[PDB]
Amino acid sequence: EYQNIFTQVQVGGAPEMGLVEGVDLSNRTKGTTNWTLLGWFGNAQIGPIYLGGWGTVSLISGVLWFMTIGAWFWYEAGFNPAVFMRDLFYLSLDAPDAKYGLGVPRDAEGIMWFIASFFMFVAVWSWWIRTYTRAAALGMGKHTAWAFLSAIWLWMVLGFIRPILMGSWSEAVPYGIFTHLDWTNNFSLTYGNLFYNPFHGLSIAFLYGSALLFAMHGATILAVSRFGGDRELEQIVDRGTAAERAALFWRWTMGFNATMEGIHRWAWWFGVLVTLTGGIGILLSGTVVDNWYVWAQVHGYAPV
Amino acid sequence: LSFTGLSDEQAQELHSVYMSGLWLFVTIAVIAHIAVYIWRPWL
Amino acid sequence: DLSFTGLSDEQAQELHSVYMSGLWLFVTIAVIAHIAVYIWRPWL
Amino acid sequence: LSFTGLSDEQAQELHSVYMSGLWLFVTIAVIAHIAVYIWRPWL
Amino acid sequence: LSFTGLSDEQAQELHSVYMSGLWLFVTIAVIAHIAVYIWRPWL
Amino acid sequence: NYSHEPNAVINLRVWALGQMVWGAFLAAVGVVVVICLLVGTYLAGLLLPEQSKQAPSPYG
Amino acid sequence: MSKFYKIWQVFDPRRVFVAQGVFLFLLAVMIHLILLSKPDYNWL
Amino acid sequence: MSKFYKIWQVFDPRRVFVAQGVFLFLLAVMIHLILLSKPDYNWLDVGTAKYGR
Amino acid sequence: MSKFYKIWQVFDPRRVFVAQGVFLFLLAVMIHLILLSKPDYNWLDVGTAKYGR
Amino acid sequence: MSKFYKIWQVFDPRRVFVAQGVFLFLLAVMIHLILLSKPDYNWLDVGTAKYGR
Amino acid sequence: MSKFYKIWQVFDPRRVFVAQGVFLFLLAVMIHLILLSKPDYNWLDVGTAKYGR
Amino acid sequence: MSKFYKIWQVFDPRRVFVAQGVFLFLLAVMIHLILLSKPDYNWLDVGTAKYGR
Amino acid sequence: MVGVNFFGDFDLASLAIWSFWGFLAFLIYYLQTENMREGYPLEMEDGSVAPNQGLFPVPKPKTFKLPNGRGEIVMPSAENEAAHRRNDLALARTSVSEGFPHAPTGNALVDGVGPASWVPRRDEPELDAHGHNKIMPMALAKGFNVTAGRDPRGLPVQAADLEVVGRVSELWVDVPEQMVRYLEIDLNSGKKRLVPMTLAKIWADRVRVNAIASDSFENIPATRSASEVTKLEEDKISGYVAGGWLYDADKRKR
Amino acid sequence: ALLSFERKYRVPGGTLVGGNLFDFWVGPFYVGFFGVTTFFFAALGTLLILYGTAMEGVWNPQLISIEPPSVENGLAFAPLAEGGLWQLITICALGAFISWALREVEICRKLGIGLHIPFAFSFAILAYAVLVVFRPLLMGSWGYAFPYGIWTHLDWVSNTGYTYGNFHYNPAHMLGISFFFTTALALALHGALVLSAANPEKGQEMKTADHEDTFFRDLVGYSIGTLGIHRLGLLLALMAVFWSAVCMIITGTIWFDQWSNWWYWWVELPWWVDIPGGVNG
Ligand SMILES: CCCCCCCCCCCCCCCCCC(=O)OC[C@H](COP(=O)([O-])OCC(O)COP(=O)([O-])OC[C@@H](COC(=O)CCCCCCCCCCCCCCCCC)OC(=O)CCCCCCCCCCCCCCCCC)OC(=O)CCCCCCCCCCCCCCCCC
Ligand code: BCL
Ligand SMILES: COC(C)(C)C/C=C/C(C)=C/C=C/C(C)=C/C=C/C(C)=C/C=C/C=C(C)/C=C/C=C(\C)CC/C=C(\C)CCC=C(C)C
Ligand SMILES: COC(C)(C)C/C=C/C(C)=C/C=C/C(C)=C/C=C/C(C)=C/C=C/C=C(C)/C=C/C=C(\C)CC/C=C(\C)CCC=C(C)C
Ligand SMILES: COC(C)(C)C/C=C/C(C)=C/C=C/C(C)=C/C=C/C(C)=C/C=C/C=C(C)/C=C/C=C(\C)CC/C=C(\C)CCC=C(C)C
Ligand SMILES: COC(C)(C)C/C=C/C(C)=C/C=C/C(C)=C/C=C/C(C)=C/C=C\C=C(C)\C=C\C=C(/C)CC/C=C(\C)CCC=C(C)C
Ligand SMILES: [Fe+2]
């Protein structure tokens, strides 16, 4: 009747600084912290981070990005702090005017957008390389980078590629909290009803499937945590009744099952296919299809 | 054969009582069906 | 000889006879009701 | 050779019985498709 | 050699029966294609 | 001493009736809970403004 | 037709009786709610 | 046809009977609803009109 | 055509039986529904029309 | 052409049987459907046209 | 050209035959459909016209 | 150039061969379709015109 | 590339969606084959090998090279399944047909069947990267102190029959993870026995174990070492305890 | 039909209702009382979908659509050809889902594992119900629910969302979105991490939990732990669906206008309203 959601008893010790497997220890920090508010739901150690080159690139570029957008927010607000904290959500570093096409915008808002985007480019790619390297230094696999690359694919398709194919940086997303929502709506409305973008439907299928799957996996692993199912790496190699019971639950339930490694394989795909299908479905919007409801009618999933 | 642990005698008894109740049920139900045909016919 | 269930031809013939009794009863009822529904409202 | 544990004789018997059932199925189906073709041809 | 551990004789046998079934299939299909062609050709 | 039925058939009959009625009571409990659920829902809906029952249809 | 008592050798009768109680009560409510829906057959 | 009884040398009565009950009841309900779907063959509304109720 | 029974030296009759049972039932249901959606073979609407109801 | 009985020394009869059965069935269905979707090969529409129904 | 039996020493013939089978079926379907599209090679429309059906 | 054979010391043959098959198929399927798109190169429409059908 | 159909209505969009269907098919193949590394070949109830081995074939073996010189593990393999294979099973067929249960012949919590089942993991403990044991009692774990929560040590252990059996003594911890896995009991019978923390609910005045009753706390498997615990002993213990949610329910009160 | 370890778990027990009656397996599947119920309900709903599209004459699986009664029908039962089919299918679907959950329960207690999974599923049933049962009742009519068509419940979504302008401005919707995105994110990260440990660079030994914790501490300065990530993704999904149910039950019952006008309470606070600057001045 203990469901293992919140940890009852906390323990700790000298911080677990790390594992030296080819990591540069000098680029690592040495200060840790304990914060029990988390210990209740997870580890409490806000442990040492790695301060590297790619990380510095990312931090610098992305902070310039952030503060650039904040600068334009101020200018757009009359420098009145109360306007800033009033219209904070309604403000925007809107995207260049279509007149400029793909040329360097000849306005302030536009070039600020362009520069902030350059910074984001640098930051994201630096962080991807940082994932690759941190997994190469500890001697692990690069699955995390190839998953992130999926996210990068969508993000690029939206900021860089799709517009280049359409010939306008106007197509790209504004940097605001409500304006990028408005952008999504206007994108759907301009191009038919995006629902009828089969790849949109697939990305949705995989988002819902990711939630489905993580609830399944998590509830299972907490159910078999009384047999140490939380320790998975050791149930792939030294199988125990945790894995057997989980597999047999799902077998007796739906007729098929997985293994303590293959469920992880299933997760890595439902995740990345959310942004692989999205990128394609966004590329094809306006370059291959100016309206999706009619494509549906013609293709048979929508009625005449 | 006896999958459930019962013998032909016990099963005969149990079936007798079950079908007693069954014929009671059908009697009551045909009565009520008749009365309803009286009230709101359907054929 | 072959029995994935344990029943030998004897128990099998017994069980089958009773099952077919029940089946023919079911079918008699259904035939009666179909004839009736034909009288009241034919469907061919 | 037997992937299921049968011998040729058990198989032959099972097959005679399966064939009986199949021919009965086909027989009723033929009767019915005939009655249909007499009642509302589709060709 | 065998990737499944069958001997040439069991295999020759299996293939005989498989080919027989296949040829029965094709024969019925040909009957049907002929009927169809007589009733409503397509070429 | 009381509660003692000499007859075998009467003992079997009162047992089977108990079993059947137990099941029917379970079913009634379930039906009643569903009913209370939906009806309380409708009622709480009667507490809502009139614009709730005015809303346009999505045609579907 | 006379060897039907052999069903109680197949299924535990306790559970079967509870299940029949459920099934019949639910069927009753089903039809009553079917009839209640129709103004011609509603009585309230 | 003489030897159909061997079916119970293949299947067990319990699972077979569960299957049979489920399938037959399902089929019955299905066909009754099929009929009730037609403004005809709907015994209820038919009787309602016949008796002018 | 003389050694088909050898199929049961390959497949297990339990599975085969259940499979073909499901297969036939669904096939029949689909064909029936097909006709039922074609109003020239909808025996119900026909019998309505032929008998003037 | 004479040695083709060795595809049974390479494959397993069970999987091939089930797979090719699925294949044949789904093929038959796709083809019947392609016909039905064309008014000149729909035996049903053609019949109701030919018999003046 | 004669040594091409050595590709069976790099590839599992099972994998390869399955993959070839799939590739072949899919290619064929794809092509037959590219034909059914063009009104000039849809042998069914062609027959309808030729035979005045 | 005759010492290019060391490529089989660097790369695995199986991986290379599989990648090669997929690469070539996709390229070819693509090229044929790009050609198909333009009417001047759609050999089928061309034929429909050469033979006046 | 708008309104550009290669043939029929087929444009880049159609080509892409179809290519995706194909890739997806291959992917389902891949995943449902990689989910076969454990459990296959399929068995009957007799322990034999059955004809239906699935429509997806078991894949080709890979290799896991373990840390701390524990060797190479090959999945799928015969060694892998035969090690984790249980024998001398106290079970009785309920019917000659398949698809019906198999009853426990004796005491199941002991006989290791059902929810109380265990698996022969290797009687070597679980290790961290450094090769030190993962589970240490909090007293050998240098530096380990309770940083929060209710310190259970010394609290009585109430059981499913509401009766009391002993007092907690020590906490067994996952040092690399910094969390409490097992807790130890100083039982009335003079014995020490472990119980998983996930099966024990720390109250303010006590520790409640609604899984099992009191008769069971004594027959719990023990540890050949009081400073370490192996994966095998862990599975035995955990199965025994978890089986009480079914096999000691006639005793559970409240 | 069995795995090499499926036997010692195939023991009797763990049944909420029923007993020996229905304690058996059909192939891989366990079928208790509730297995029978879910099969019956599912099959019936499926066949009714097919008959509904048969009556319509539609046979394309993407264009098949069984729609709810009109809004004018109100909360009464309708003819099968005008909503009764949708309603029966809804009944059967709900019975099927609840029975699936209870089957999961029976199995969880036969295999002696916790009941987290049926709990998780309960939220999804709750949301489906919010859509087809509750929200209507409170809105006065079954016709406000969604249809059973692959590409038509999307039209219901669109029209229902454009009734209140850009639904994006619903805050509970915002939270649903956010939790869904974070769920997919954490799922990918978990899978990638584990696979990267088990399947490392060539010529290297398998890794352990310590390496995962260290890699993510290196990356972002915090690691949640092997148990915490499961806890987390579970809670993320649940709160997402919680917020998603909350977003819909308040859409046409407590709210009635465009959702944008909600955030204007922050603008219209007297001490920054009149200020002439920014977007709202
Ligand atoms: C007419 C057409 C008809 C239909 C045609 C259909 C044909 C089907 C053919 C079969 C294809 C099946 C593919 C799936 C198999 C993968 C199985 C798996 O999970 O692991 C396998 C297994 C994983 O190994 P492991 O178990 O992790 O351990 C290995 C090591 O020990 C330790 O690992 P490690 O750390 O060394 O490496 C880890 C990595 C092992 O793999 C690798 O190391 C290499 C992975 C590929 C990385 C990229 C290659 C380098 C160049 C990239 C160029 C990018 C340009 C951008 C700028 C540069 C960025 C770097 O593990 C993986 O999981 C690899 C799979 C990654 C797939 C790609 C995911 C990210 C893509 C996101 C989208 C971005 C591109 C846009 C796509 C859309 C375009 C329109 O790897 C393999 O079996 C070989 C690798 C396969 C190479 C890639 C080929 C497949 C890519 C498909 C992507 C989807 C395309 C879209 C579909 C079509 C839509 C229209
Ligand atoms: C009303 C408007 C249209 C619509 C318009 C669009 C548009 C337009 C898009 C989608 C897209 C998506 N929509 Mg929508 N969408 C609609 C209807 C729906 C419905 C529904 C139930 O009706 C659902 C559930 C969905 C579902 C989805 C997702 C499946 C998909 C995006 C997934 C994702 O991860 O995005 C978010 C993922 C990313 C952007 C990844 C970005 C990662 C990078 C690396 C971020 C950098 C980090 C940065 C530096 C910040 C630093 C933070 C600090 C360090 C903390 N939409 C309606 C009908 N939707 C997307 C898609 O794929 O299109 C097909 C998309 O672009
Ligand atoms: C959508 O398409 C529509 C529906 C319109 C058209 C299609 C309809 C279809 C396809 C319908 C199909 C119907 C079918 C296939 C019907 C089949 C019916 C059968 C086979 C009925 C069998 C009934 C058998 C019964 C009722 C047997 C009952 C037996 C008993 C009650 C007693 C048995 C006693 C026993 C076994 C005791 C002995 C046991 C032991 C252990 C000694
Ligand atoms: C678009 O598609 C449409 C539908 C329009 C057109 C296409 C339709 C298609 C593709 C239809 C395909 C139909 C097919 C392939 C039909 C096949 C039917 C078959 C093969 C039916 C077989 C029936 C067999 C039966 C009923 C056998 C019964 C046997 C028994 C009752 C006895 C069982 C065996 C016993 C008792 C022996 C046991 C002995 C021992 C020793 C154990
Ligand atoms: C758009 O595309 C369309 C459809 C319009 C045009 C394209 C169509 C295409 C691509 C069609 C392709 C068709 C193909 C490739 C068809 C291939 C058909 C084959 C290979 C059929 C084979 C049938 C085989 C059968 C029926 C075999 C039956 C065998 C038996 C019954 C014998 C039983 C065997 C036993 C007992 C084995 C003996 C075992 C032991 C142990 C002795
Ligand atoms: C408190 O005030 C101060 C000033 C102190 C600080 C405040 C800062 C504030 C308020 C910051 C707010 C930031 C906000 C609201 C950011 C929101 C960003 C959002 C919602 C972005 C959404 C989507 C963005 C996308 C998809 C952008 C993609 C961009 C790219 C892929 C860039 C690719 C490259 C481009 C466009 C061209 C440049 C390329 C090269 C090679 C130079
Ligand atoms: Fe996990």
Numbering used by the authors:
A (entry chain M): 3 to 306
B (entry chain 8), D (entry chain B), E (entry chain E): 7 to 49
C (entry chain 0): 6 to 49
F (entry chain X): 5 to 64
G (entry chain 7): 1 to 44
H (entry chain 9), I (entry chain A), J (entry chain D), K (entry chain F), L (entry chain I): 1 to 53
M (entry chain H): 1 to 254
N (entry chain L): 2 to 282
What does the published report state?
In purple photosynthetic bacteria, the membrane-bound RCs closely associate with light-harvesting complex 1 (LH1) to form the RC-LH1 core supercomplexes (2–14). The RC then uses the energy to initiate a charge separation and electron transfer, ultimately creating proton gradients across the chromatophore membrane to produce adenosine 5′-triphosphate (ATP).
In the RC-LH1 dimer, two crossing PufX polypeptides mediate dimerization. Unlike Rhodabacter sphaeroides counterpart, Rba. blasticus RC-LH1 dimer has a less bent conformation, lacks the PufY subunit near the LH1 opening, and includes two extra LH1 αβ subunits, forming a more enclosed S-shaped LH1 ring. Our cryo-EM structure shows that the dimerization interface of the RC-LH1 supercomplex in Rba. blasticus involves two PufX polypeptides. The crossing angle for the PufX dimer in Rba. blasticus is approximately 84°, which is greater than that of the Rba. sphaeroides PufX dimer (73°). In addition to the interactions of the N-terminal region of PufX with LH1-1α of the adjacent monomer, direct hydrogen bonds were found at the interface of two PufX polypeptides (between Glu9 and Gln23) to facilitate the PufX dimerization, whereas no detectable polar interactions were identified at the same interface in the Rba. sphaeroides RC-LH1 dimer. Therefore, it is postulated that Glu9, Asn15, and Gln23 of PufX are important for maintaining the dimerization of Rba. blasticus PufX and RC-LH1. The dimeric RC-LH1 of Rba. blasticus contains double the number of cofactors as the monomeric RC-LH1, and the locations of these pigment molecules are similar. LH1-1 and LH1-1′ from neighboring monomers are closely associated, characterized by BChls with Mg-Mg distances of approximately 8.6 Å.
